[model samples]
Target: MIRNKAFVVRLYPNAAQTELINRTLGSARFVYNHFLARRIAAYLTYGQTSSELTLLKQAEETSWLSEVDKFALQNSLKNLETAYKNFFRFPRFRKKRTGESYRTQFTNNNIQIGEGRLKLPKLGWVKTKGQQDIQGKILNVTVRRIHEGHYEASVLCEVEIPYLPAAPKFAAGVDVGIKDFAIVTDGVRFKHEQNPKYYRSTLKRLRKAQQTLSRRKKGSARYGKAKTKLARIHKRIVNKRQDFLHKLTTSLVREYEIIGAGWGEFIRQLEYKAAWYGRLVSKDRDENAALNIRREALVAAG
Candidate 1:
């Protein structure tokens, strides 16, 4: 099976490289804002959406834009087109400081990954620190600023992984709830597991961080550090939740021949992961609900 995955690595760049990165970031934002305004103007004045080529030509007049990566500038326009299509509304302006990101799609010849370094278009070789092994053909790269004001590179690589099939032994039905994470049954047996509310457990610490951030003066360096700390708390919560879900779903998929769960986001993740692991997920609507009703009726009659 062909799959795409990203290997995110912390970047270490010298002064010159840093300047180039900042320039690319600024140029992309500038083009995005300029084109967005033009798009809105054309719609209001001429009753038409604009073309990608026309927008690019308009940006070409500015000599400063030529200093940035050509692919980065072009991709910004593509992203704008996607936002307009996806939202069916006027795309908002790309702001300066919330988070800065730009992407550069690369062919095999233009990109390479070595022991502790990466070579990308316009940026040349730079140092990176990451545990994720670069396991596939390089496709695209996204450079973004994360919490703590650190820059990182997410390299999207394509790989073909062989499917691992589990031998059929038993089938199970699962009920998901907020109180109990899962109540699973296989005909004659039942098992219940408590919900590990990762977010709820970490709420106290997150609230404390927010309070500290709120006390800081806006536009100060101390305020920026505090805000980044708060953002890190949120990032940790998300990572924990995703880790728990992945582990629980993989174990269930390995144990069951066929799995059924209510139609929700959890089930959606299970469905895709089950596919990746060569398992089947199907739903028989109201089947479990009817079983619960019959058991209640039996108890009442006695």
Candidate 2:
């Protein structure tokens, strides 16, 4: 199958470019919200939801907005289409808010990569460092600010046929749970490390660092020192987690050419969605660990 991927490109531009990118992103958000507004309004009047495509046509003669500004309209329809298909439900009304930077949406017209630079709508061109290949026909692009405070562009591309590896006879049922890190299809088990690693132990250090930071006056050397140390501990923990996951997955993938076992993919999906919401309440790793353990038990039985 063909997929849309993006490679970061570099741009030679000035402050105007940054502003332009912001505008383009904002513009795309505006279009989505506009469609969303009409959808909500129609529902309010008739107590019924209309097709997204039908609503797009209604924008044709709108005086305040131009047709050229509706490029994102189609992508929004696609998003709605997917959501409906997956959840088997209609769109809910969301009120349009003024001046607020709304959620981002995919934009087809504004994103392109050529040579070593990326040409973004309004932003002209920018320099990209990471190269994710944008293959086949590009469907759409979305610019988002990740929780880690980095700007990222996700490109969606479509290809007619996918390159397939002669399907491997891999029947690996992996039980990834809290008690044990993971158990593979072939009865391979990895023990979970509850005693925080030397690196992970730094989480406590981070908290202590913050506490120490409060004792120092603002802009004071001691406070700044505590902050930097805290940052280091955090970075260390993140890096360790990344490294561990990568190594574990790689090992499991290598253990068998044809694996067979029970896996808990459905539970995994729920856990991910729940985890996203849980972030707003608490980032406690324990809850995730417990779920993982229970799922692992279920998978083991399967």
lDDT of 1: 0.69
- Clashing residue pairs in all predictions, respectively, total 0, 23
Q: What range of 10 consecutive residues in model 1 has the weakest lDDT sum?
A: 44-53
Look at candidate 2 and tell me the lDDT of residue 184.
Answer: 41
Write one digit per residue (lDDT tens) for candidate 2, span 74-172: 454445445445655445633322212212233555656665566655456666555555556655555443222234455555633343333232333
- Every model's TM-score: 0.76, 0.48
Give the lowest summed-lDDT range of ten residues in model 2.
275-284
RMSD (Cα, Å) for all candidates, in order, is 6.3, 10.3
Q: How displaced is residue 190 in candidate 1, in Å?
A: 4.5
Model 2, residue 142: C-alpha shift (Å):
1.5
Tens-place lDDT digits, model 1, residues 1-302: 87676778887776777678888888889878887787777662122223443445455576667777777877887787777667774878988874688888886567788788888788888788873776688888787766544678888888665566764435555665445666665555665545556557677788989999889998899898888888788776656666666666777777765565223556766877777777766543334643453344334433
